[PDB]
Scaffold this active site. Structure first.
Site, PDB file in Angstrom:
ATOM      1  N   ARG A 120       0.848  -1.188   0.000  1.00  0.00           N
ATOM      2  CA  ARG A 120       0.000   0.000   0.000  1.00  0.00           C
ATOM      3  C   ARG A 120       0.882   1.236   0.000  1.00  0.00           C
ATOM      4  NH1 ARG A 120      -5.016   1.648   3.375  1.00  0.00           N
ATOM      5  NH2 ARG A 120      -4.568   3.323   1.836  1.00  0.00           N
ATOM      6  N   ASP A 151      -3.264  -1.084   8.278  1.00  0.00           N
ATOM      7  CA  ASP A 151      -2.323  -0.080   8.831  1.00  0.00           C
ATOM      8  C   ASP A 151      -1.666  -0.663  10.100  1.00  0.00           C
ATOM      9  OD1 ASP A 151      -3.178   1.871   6.952  1.00  0.00           O
ATOM     10  OD2 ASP A 151      -3.909   3.268   8.478  1.00  0.00           O
ATOM     11  N   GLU A 155      -3.583  14.393   4.559  1.00  0.00           N
ATOM     12  CA  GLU A 155      -2.464  14.075   3.671  1.00  0.00           C
ATOM     13  C   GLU A 155      -2.342  15.131   2.592  1.00  0.00           C
ATOM     14  OE1 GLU A 155      -3.021   9.234   4.237  1.00  0.00           O
ATOM     15  OE2 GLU A 155      -4.326  10.385   2.889  1.00  0.00           O
ATOM     16  N   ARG A 190      -6.140  16.245   1.565  1.00  0.00           N
ATOM     17  CA  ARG A 190      -7.326  15.498   1.956  1.00  0.00           C
ATOM     18  C   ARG A 190      -7.976  16.150   3.166  1.00  0.00           C
ATOM     19  NH1 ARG A 190      -6.622   9.127   3.816  1.00  0.00           N
ATOM     20  NH2 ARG A 190      -8.597   8.869   4.983  1.00  0.00           N
ATOM     21  N   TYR A 220      -5.035   5.348  -3.019  1.00  0.00           N
ATOM     22  CA  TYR A 220      -3.811   6.136  -2.910  1.00  0.00           C
ATOM     23  C   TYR A 220      -3.052   6.058  -4.234  1.00  0.00           C
ATOM     24  CZ  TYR A 220      -4.045   6.986   2.189  1.00  0.00           C
ATOM     25  OH  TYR A 220      -4.383   7.401   3.459  1.00  0.00           O
TER      26      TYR A 220
END
Length: 658
Positions: A207, A232, A503, A519, A615
């Site tokens: 990721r 995560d 972000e 974001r 992403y």
């Protein structure tokens, strides 16, 4: 071997095509392979590409199908009511729809193997599922099969799951073809893989892609190599890198930029079922969210990433502690010794472990790799491995000794369980990386670290200034270095959001003028501007014309080197959807030289509005093409966790976008 049946040029226009008389009498034996080359750029919500069914009244649930959804999911059903078998195997985000204004030919390979009792699906050279069953059901052994159909399944004489698309070629074999044979089947992929399952990282998942074009012409990429599914932190994750010397045509075998060794690098198939999919490696240290920049003066490449101690992620990180102690305007990493309930130690000059309670040096030192030494001798801990052999996730010692690191669970001295930022550098443009070093805290002793914005840092074109965006509650925190990353200061820019994953990525509109796109929590991408090389920042504005979800998605952004329609251009990459992480676009904005406002003039659709896009990383390649490395799936959706080989690379030209 030769196919028992082969046909092609089938148009699926919401009308099934009956191939019973061509195929049914040719099926024999318990193993079969289907190879199908097909297009679908306007699929129905749920449609069957291929069907074998009992079409008689009373046998509605006796069929085999290969189906797809307009989400890009692919799957099969294998059903026999008399046998009491109803198998459904599928994987989300397995398909391409369109690329550069043209429907993509997907190459599907489905292997039904009676010997190993396994059904395996490949699409575009990627294994998307492999399911072993106790009771095998050969696709030709469904009770009363009397129809073979393209573009629907015939149930009780009616067309179910009608398809819109085309099948350019379909082949059937009375054999389960080998993994080797599968690899020889020609493909028509619009994409490449840079990082992938089975490569040198030994991570089954990836990721958070990045891309950055270096002055030599080399293009560098970093990424999260995620071992414990796509979760995560807390997890096991390393940062890996790969580079291309030929404008993205081929990529080097990955190496690590940042890694921990408390847990084995294991290629693991993470469970995707509803009971187990939230299993999470809970005792490992990890890195997460990398960002890269190149320093013109030194020629060094600089990579930052978040660092998480064993068992720590954003959710359980100590929010009121930096992990450092301030003593005389200097910061020292704090340590807790096992048996103590408080942090009585600091790491002082030359790695000396110092007792703050007695103000005496100890016989312990920390080396540059954050490893613990006693009287100069390296201490070790036993490494962990993970497995699901027992039905649930187990983390256990594997017999291997590794250097004792202060970020580890088993270490005698442990850092504060909070998030940090680390930096590494490369003096050979990504061929090797140095041992990482922690950045100092920027917001005081009692504030946790900020979170790195993944993607690129910004190297100002007319000075030596380097900037990495980070975020925390209530602000963007820009980290600024004018000395090749030796020292850093912060520049805070308040934003009107509490607890946003803000972000942010930057472009230099002209010398000294930075626009940051980020974001938010509002469903709109925001921006702010600095006109003094990042010293001070404007209020926040919003981009109209692009939608994001309420939770948002990372946006990547570059300043393109060439004029477009006679104007300076900025390119943004983001999903464009209020619903999910899908509908990926590159959006071309033309800058107005009077007021630095941007006209978002062209929107290029990466693939279908309904296909996943999360992403992303974009860069201008040295030949002025655009490279895009992106998560081709919904990395938010709880239904699309733990998919392999979905971070993908494509090459685009400006002509494609406009």
């Amino acid at each position: 071997i030769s196919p028992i049946f082969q046909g092609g040029s089938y148009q699926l226009n919401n009308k099934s095509i009956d191939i019973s008389s061509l195929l049914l009498d040719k099926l024999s034996g318990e193993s079969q392979t289907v190879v199908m080359k097909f297009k679908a750029d306007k699929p129905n919500s749920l449609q069957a590409l291929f069907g074998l069914s009992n079409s008689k009244a009373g046998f509605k649930n006796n069929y085999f199908s290969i189906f797809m959804r307009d989400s890009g999911e692919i799957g099969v059903e294998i059903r026999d009511a008399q046998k009491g078998i109803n198998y459904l195997f599928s994987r989300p985000a397995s398909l391409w729809g369109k690329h550069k204004g043209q429907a993509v030919e997907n190459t599907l390979v489905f292997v039904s193997d009676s010997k190993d009792k396994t059904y395996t699906m490949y699409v575009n050279g990627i294994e998307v599922f492999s399911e072993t069953v106790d009771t095998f059901l050969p696709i030709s052994n469904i009770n009363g099969i009397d129809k073979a159909t393209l573009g629907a399944v015939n149930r009780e004489g009616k067309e179910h799951y009608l398809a819109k698309g085309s099948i350019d070629e379909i082949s059937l074999f009375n054999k389960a073809i080998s993994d080797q044979e599968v690899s020889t089947i020609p493909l028509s992929n619009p994409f490449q893989l840079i990082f992938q399952s089975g490569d040198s990282t030994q991570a089954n998942y990836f990721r958070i892609p990045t891309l950055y074009t270096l002055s030599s012409g080399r293009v560098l990429s970093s990424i999260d190599a995620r071992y414990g599914g796509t979760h995560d932190s807390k997890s096991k994750i390393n940062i890996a890198t790969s580079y291309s010397d030929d404008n993205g045509k081929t990529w080097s075998e990955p190496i690590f930029a940042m890694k921990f060794n408390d847990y084995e690098e294991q290629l693991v198939y993470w469970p995707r079922d509803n009971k187990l999919k939230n299993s999470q490696i809970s005792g490992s240290a990890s890195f997460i969210d990398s960002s890269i920049v190149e320093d013109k003066k030194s020629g060094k490449t600089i990579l930052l990433a978040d660092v998480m101690p064993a068992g720590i992620g954003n959710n359980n990180a100590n929010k009121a502690d930096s992990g450092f102690k301030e003593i005389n305007g200097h910061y020292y990493l704090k340590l807790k010794k096992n048996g103590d309930n408080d942090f009585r130690y600091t790491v002082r000059e030359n790695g000396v472990v110092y007792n703050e309670t007695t103000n005496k040096p100890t016989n312990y030192t920390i080396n540059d790799k954050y490893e613990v030494l006693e009287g100069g001798k390296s201490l070790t801990v036993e490494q962990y491995s993970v497995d699901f052999d027992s039905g649930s996730l187990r983390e256990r010692h594997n017999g291997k000794q590794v250097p004792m690191n202060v970020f580890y669970k088993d270490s005698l001295f442990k850092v504060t369980p909070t998030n940090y930022i680390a930096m590494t550098t490369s003096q050979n443009r990504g061929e090797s990386w140095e041992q990482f070093k922690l950045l100092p805290p920027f917001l005081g002793e009692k504030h946790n670290g900020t979170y790195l914005c993944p993607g690129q840092g910004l190297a100002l074109k007319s000075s030596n200034r380097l900037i990495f965006a980070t975020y925390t509650s209530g602000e963007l925190t820009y980290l600024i270095s004018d000395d090749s990353g030796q020292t850093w200061k912060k520049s805070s820019a308040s934003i009107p959001f509490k607890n946003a994953t803000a972000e942010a990525q930057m472009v230099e509109l002209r010398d000294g003028v930075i626009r940051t796109f980020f974001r938010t929590t509002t469903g709109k991408i925001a921006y702010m501007t600095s006109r003094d090389s990042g010293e001070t920042w404007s209020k926040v504005s919003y981009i109209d014309g692009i939608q994001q979800t309420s939770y948002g998605t990372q946006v990547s952004a570059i300043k393109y080197s060439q004029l477009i329609d006679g104007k300076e251009a900025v390119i943004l990459s983001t999903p464009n959807s209020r619903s999910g992480r899908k509908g990926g676009q590159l959006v071309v904005g033309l800058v107005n030289k009077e007021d630095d406002s941007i006209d978002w003039k062209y929107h290029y659709g990466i693939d279908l509005p309904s296909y996943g896009y999360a992403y992303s990383a974009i860069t201008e390649l040295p030949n002025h093409h655009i490279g895009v490395l992106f998560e081709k799936y919904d990395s938010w959706s709880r239904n699309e966790l733990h998919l392999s080989n979905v971070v993908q690379y494509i090459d685009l030209e400006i002509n494609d976008l406009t």
